């Protein structure tokens, strides 16, 4: 359950994550990439189902983190990106699960990406993202009980006639410890 005060906190942070992100995707893709951040509260079951099968999911955590989060990228952007960083244009996004090199090359891509997220957070809780597991099928992750609420961070990656989404799933069972210390005792 989230506060209407704490919500404005996360908006400020992640909005910033989209700024460095916008500038990262642009430097990868080699052409301008606008990114618009949207954030919302949703049931974990309600999010996990809005994930298209198959897709590229990466469940991560940090050192000071108690639990784990999700960083999902829709396959169209995924394959568009791989096409680029390999000397190609990126005109056809295939509809299958990424292979050995595909996932291995894209892993390091979401690590850099994940880092900036950790940097937009540096003012509240610095952390060094350490990616736990990668899975191509969502009905296989089940991070925490399906009823819990999540802070879903949505990033509208657009450019050209193209437009996809990058989601960061911030569970409440990971936000409660730093919720009470940072947005409550000294701030309030």
């Amino acid at each position: 359950k989230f506060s209407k005060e704490q919500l404005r906190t996360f908006q400020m942070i992640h909005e910033n994550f989209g700024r460095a992100l916008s500038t990262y995707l642009s430097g990868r893709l080699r052409t301008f990439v606008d990114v618009e951040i949207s954030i919302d509260q949703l049931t974990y079951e309600e999010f996990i189902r809005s994930v298209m099968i198959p897709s590229f999911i990466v469940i991560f955590t940090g050192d000071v983190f108690e639990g784990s989060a999700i960083f999902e990228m829709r396959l169209d952007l995924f394959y568009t990106m791989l096409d680029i960083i390999m000397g190609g244009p990126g005109e056809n996004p295939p509809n299958r699960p990424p292979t050995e090199i595909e996932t291995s090359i894209m892993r390091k891509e979401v690590t850099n990406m994940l880092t900036l997220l950790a940097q937009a957070w540096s003012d509240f809780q610095y952390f060094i993202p350490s990616i736990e597991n990668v899975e191509t099928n969502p009905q296989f992750v089940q991070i925490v009980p399906p009823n819990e609420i999540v802070l879903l961070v949505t990033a509208s990656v657009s450019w050209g006639e193209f437009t996809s989404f990058i989601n960061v799933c911030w569970p409440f069972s990971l936000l409660e410890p730093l919720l009470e210390k940072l947005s409550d005792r000294f701030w309030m």
């Binding site: 000397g87 190609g88 090199i101 595909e102 090359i105």
Partner: protein, 80 residues
């Protein structure tokens, strides 16, 4: 031979671009062989791409390299 076959069974999967890169460095006639042992859906594709490779990356190549060399039983000259 055993090379070409593993390289095809392996390359058949990969992105039309992924193949495009690997085959790029390959020996031209051996290139046409694999490029040949693939279905016409990708030939045309892999080939359109192999044409448009002005670019070149030292970390993705050296990644694919360190990936075949631990899947295909031995990468030779070409990529060396």
């Amino acid at each position: 031979g055993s090379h070409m076959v593993q390289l095809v069974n392996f390359l058949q999967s990969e992105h039309p671009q992924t193949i495009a890169v690997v085959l790029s460095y390959l020996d031209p006639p051996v290139a046409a062989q694999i490029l040949g042992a693939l279905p016409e859906e990708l030939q045309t594709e892999v080939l359109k791409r192999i044409a448009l490779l002005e670019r070149t990356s030292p970390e993705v190549v050296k990644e694919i390299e360190r990936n075949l060399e631990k899947k295909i039983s031995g990468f030779s000259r070409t990529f060396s």
